[PDB]
Amino acid sequence: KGINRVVLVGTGAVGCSYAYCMINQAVAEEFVLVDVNEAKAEGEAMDLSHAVPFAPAPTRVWKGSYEDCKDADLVVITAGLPQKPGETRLDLVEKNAKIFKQIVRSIMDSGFDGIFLIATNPVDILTYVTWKESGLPKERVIGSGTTLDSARFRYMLGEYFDIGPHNIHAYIIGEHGDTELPVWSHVSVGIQKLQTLLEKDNTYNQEDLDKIFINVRDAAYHIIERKGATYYGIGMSLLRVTKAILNDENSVLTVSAYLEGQYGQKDVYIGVPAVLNRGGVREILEVELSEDEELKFDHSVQVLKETMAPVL
Amino acid sequence: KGINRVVLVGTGAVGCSYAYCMINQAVAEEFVLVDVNEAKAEGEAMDLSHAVPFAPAPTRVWKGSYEDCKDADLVVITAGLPQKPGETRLDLVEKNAKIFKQIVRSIMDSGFDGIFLIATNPVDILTYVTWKESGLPKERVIGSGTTLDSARFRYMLGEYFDIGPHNIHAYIIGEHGDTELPVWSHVSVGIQKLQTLLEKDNTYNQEDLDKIFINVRDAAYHIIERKGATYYGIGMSLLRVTKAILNDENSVLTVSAYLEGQYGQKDVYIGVPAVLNRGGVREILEVELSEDEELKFDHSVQVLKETMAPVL
Amino acid sequence: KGINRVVLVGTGAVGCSYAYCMINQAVAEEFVLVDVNEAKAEGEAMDLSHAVPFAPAPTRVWKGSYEDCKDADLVVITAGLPQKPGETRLDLVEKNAKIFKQIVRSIMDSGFDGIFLIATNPVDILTYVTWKESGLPKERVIGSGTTLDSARFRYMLGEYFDIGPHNIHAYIIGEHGDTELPVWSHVSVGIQKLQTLLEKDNTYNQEDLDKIFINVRDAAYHIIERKGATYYGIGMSLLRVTKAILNDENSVLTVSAYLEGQYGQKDVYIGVPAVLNRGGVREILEVELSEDEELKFDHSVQVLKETMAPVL
Amino acid sequence: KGINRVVLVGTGAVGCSYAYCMINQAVAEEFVLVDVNEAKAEGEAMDLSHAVPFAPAPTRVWKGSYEDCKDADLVVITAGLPQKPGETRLDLVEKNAKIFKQIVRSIMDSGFDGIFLIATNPVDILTYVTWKESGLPKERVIGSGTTLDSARFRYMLGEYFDIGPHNIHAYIIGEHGDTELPVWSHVSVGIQKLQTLLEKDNTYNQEDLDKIFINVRDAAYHIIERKGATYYGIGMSLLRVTKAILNDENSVLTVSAYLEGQYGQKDVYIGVPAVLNRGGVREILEVELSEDEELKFDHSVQVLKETMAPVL
Helix residue ranges, H only, D50-178: 89-109, 123-134, 147-161
Peptide bond into B122 cis (omega under 30): yes
CATH code for the domain of B300: 3.90.110.10
* Maximum C-alpha span of chain C: 62
Name the residue among B130, B143, B138, B151 with its Cα closest to residue B230.
B151
Q: Report CA torsion sign: B135, B137, B138, B143.
A: negative
Distance from CA of A163 to the nearest CA of C (A): 5
User: Beta strands D188-189 and D192-193: pairing type?
Assistant: antiparallel
Would you give the end-to-end CA distance of chain B in angstroms? 38
- Do A116 and A141 touch, CB atoms closer than 8 A? yes
- One domain for residues C225 and C254: yes
The nearest alpha carbon in chain D to C14 belongs to D47
Name the residue among C233, C296, C222 with its Cα closest to residue C263.
C296
Chain B contact set for C247 (CB, 8 A): 26, 29, 57-58
- One domain for residues B157 and B141: no
- Do A173 and A166 touch, CB atoms closer than 8 A? no
Chain D contact set for B190 (CB, 8 A): 252, 273, 275, 285
In total, chain C counts a number of residues equal to 312
Chain C contact set for B58 (CB, 8 A): 247, 249-251
The nearest alpha carbon in chain B to A151 belongs to B53
Q: Which residues, including other chains, have CB under 8 Å from residue A99's CB and lie 6 or more apart?
A: A79, A80, A81
C-alpha to C-alpha distance for C298 and A20, rounded to whole angstroms: 51
C-alpha to C-alpha distance for D263 and D289, rounded to whole angstroms: 8
Which residues of C lie inside 8 Å of B (Cβ-Cβ)? 2-4, 26, 29, 57-58, 73, 243, 246-251, 278
- The residue among A113, A145, A177 that closes a domain is A145
Q: Which residues, including other chains, have CB under 8 Å from residue B119's CB and lie 6 or more apart?
A: B14, B15, B18, B76, B77, B78, B143, B144, B234, B238
Backbone phi and psi for residue A89, each to the nearest 5 degrees, phi listed first? -55, -35
Which residues of D lie inside 8 Å of A (Cβ-Cβ)? 1-4, 26, 29, 57-58, 73, 243, 247-250, 278
Angle CA(B10)–CA(B13)–CA(A74) in degrees, nearest 5? Answer: 145
C-alpha to C-alpha distance for B279 and B250, rounded to whole angstroms: 10
User: Could you confirm whether D176 is annotated as catalytic?
Assistant: yes
Q: Do B191 and D273 touch (CB under 8 A)?
A: yes
Show which residues of A are catalytic.
Answer: 176
Q: Report CA torsion sign: B289, B293, B298, B300.
A: negative
Which one of B17, B22, B223, B226 would you mutate to disrupt binding with A, by most A Cβ within 10 Å of its Cβ?
Answer: B226
Domain limits for position C98: 1-145
User: Beta strands A266-277 and A251-260: pairing type?
Assistant: antiparallel
C-alpha to C-alpha distance for A167 and A158, rounded to whole angstroms: 8
Q: Do C165 and D233 touch (CB under 8 A)?
A: no
State the burial class of residue A2 (Cβ atoms within 10 Å of its Cβ: 0-12, 13-18, 19+).
middle
Instruction: Provide the number of CB pairs (under 8 Å) joining chain A to chain D.
Output: 36
The residue type at A52? V
Q: Do C48 and D231 touch (CB under 8 A)?
A: no
- One domain for residues A5 and A16: yes
- One domain for residues C151 and C138: no
Q: Do D17 and C16 touch (CB under 8 A)?
A: no
C-alpha to C-alpha distance for B240 and B234, rounded to whole angstroms: 10
The nearest alpha carbon in chain D to C153 belongs to D50
- Do A50 and B155 touch, CB atoms closer than 8 A? yes
Q: Do A42 and B155 touch (CB under 8 A)?
A: no
- One domain for residues C141 and C163: no
Helix (H) / strand (E) element for D194: namely helix D194-199
Per-residue DSSP letter, C164: -
Resolution (angstroms) equals 2.5
B192: left (phi over 0), alpha (psi -120 to 50) or beta: beta
In chain D, how many domains are there? 2
- One domain for residues A109 and A175: no
Q: Report CA torsion sign: B37, B38, B42, B45.
A: positive
Name the residue among D121, D116, D88, D84 with its Cα closest to residue D103.
D116
Q: Which residues, including other chains, have CB under 8 Å from residue B287's CB and lie 6 or more apart?
A: B183, B186, B273, D191, D192, D193, D196
Name the residue among D165, D246, D139, B106 with its Cα closest to residue C26.
D165
- One domain for residues D287 and D237: yes
- One domain for residues C136 and C154: no
Q: Which residues of D147-186 are buried (b: 16+ CB within 10 A; e: fewer)?
A: bbbbbbbbbbbbebbebbbbbbbbbbbbbbbebbbbbbbb
Partners of B169 in beta bridges: B188
B145: left (phi over 0), alpha (psi -120 to 50) or beta: left
* Maximum C-alpha span of chain D: 62
Helix, strand, coil percentages for chain D (3-state, nearest 5): 50, 20, 35
Experimental method: X-ray
Residue B153 three-state SS: helix
C-alpha to C-alpha distance for A239 and A78, rounded to whole angstroms: 13
- One domain for residues C152 and C33: no
Distance from CA of C211 to the nearest CA of D (A): 16
Q: Which residues of D99-127 are buried (b: 16+ CB within 10 A; e: fewer)?
A: bbbebbebbbebebebbbbbbbbbbbbbb
The nearest alpha carbon in chain A to D247 belongs to A29
Taking only Cα atoms into account, the Rg of chain D, rounded to an integer number of angstroms, comes to 19
C-alpha to C-alpha distance for A243 and A25, rounded to whole angstroms: 10
- Of the candidates C58, C247, C250, the beta carbon closest to that of B249 is on C58
Q: Do A232 and B51 touch (CB under 8 A)?
A: yes
- Do D61 and D31 touch, CB atoms closer than 8 A? yes
Which residues of A lie inside 8 Å of D (Cβ-Cβ)? 2-4, 26, 29, 57-58, 73, 243, 246-251, 278
C-alpha to C-alpha distance for A193 and B207, rounded to whole angstroms: 68
Q: Which residues, including other chains, have CB under 8 Å from residue C30's CB and lie 6 or more apart?
A: C3, C4, C5, C6, C59, C60
In total, chain A counts a number of residues equal to 312
User: Beta strands B5-9 and B74-77: pairing type?
Assistant: parallel
Cα atoms found within 13 Å of the Cα of residue B174, Cβ hemisphere only: 22
- One domain for residues A132 and A170: no
| Long-range interactions of B223-227: CB distance < 8 A, separation 24+ | B223/A43, B223/A46, B223/A47, B224/A43, B225/A43, B226/A39, B226/A40, B226/A42, B226/A43, B226/A44, B226/A46, B227/A39, B227/A40, B227/A43, B227/A44, B227/A47
- The residue among A101, A118, A145 that closes a domain is A145
- One domain for residues C186 and C264: yes
- Do B303 and B179 touch, CB atoms closer than 8 A? yes
CATH code for the domain of A87: 3.40.50.720
- The residue among A145, A165, A196 that closes a domain is A145
- One domain for residues A172 and A312: yes
- Of the candidates A52, A158, A165, the beta carbon closest to that of B165 is on A52
Instruction: Sheet containing B60-63: give its strands across.
Output: B60-63, B30-34, B5-9, B74-77, B115-118, B141-143, B256-260, B266-271
C-alpha to C-alpha distance for A255 and A150, rounded to whole angstroms: 10
Q: Report CA torsion sign: D163, D168, D171, D176.
A: positive
Q: Which residues of A62-100 are buried (b: 16+ CB within 10 A; e: fewer)?
A: bbbebebbebbbbbbbbbbeebeeeeebbebbebbbebb
The residue type at C120? T
Cα atoms found within 13 Å of the Cα of residue B7, Cβ hemisphere only: 25
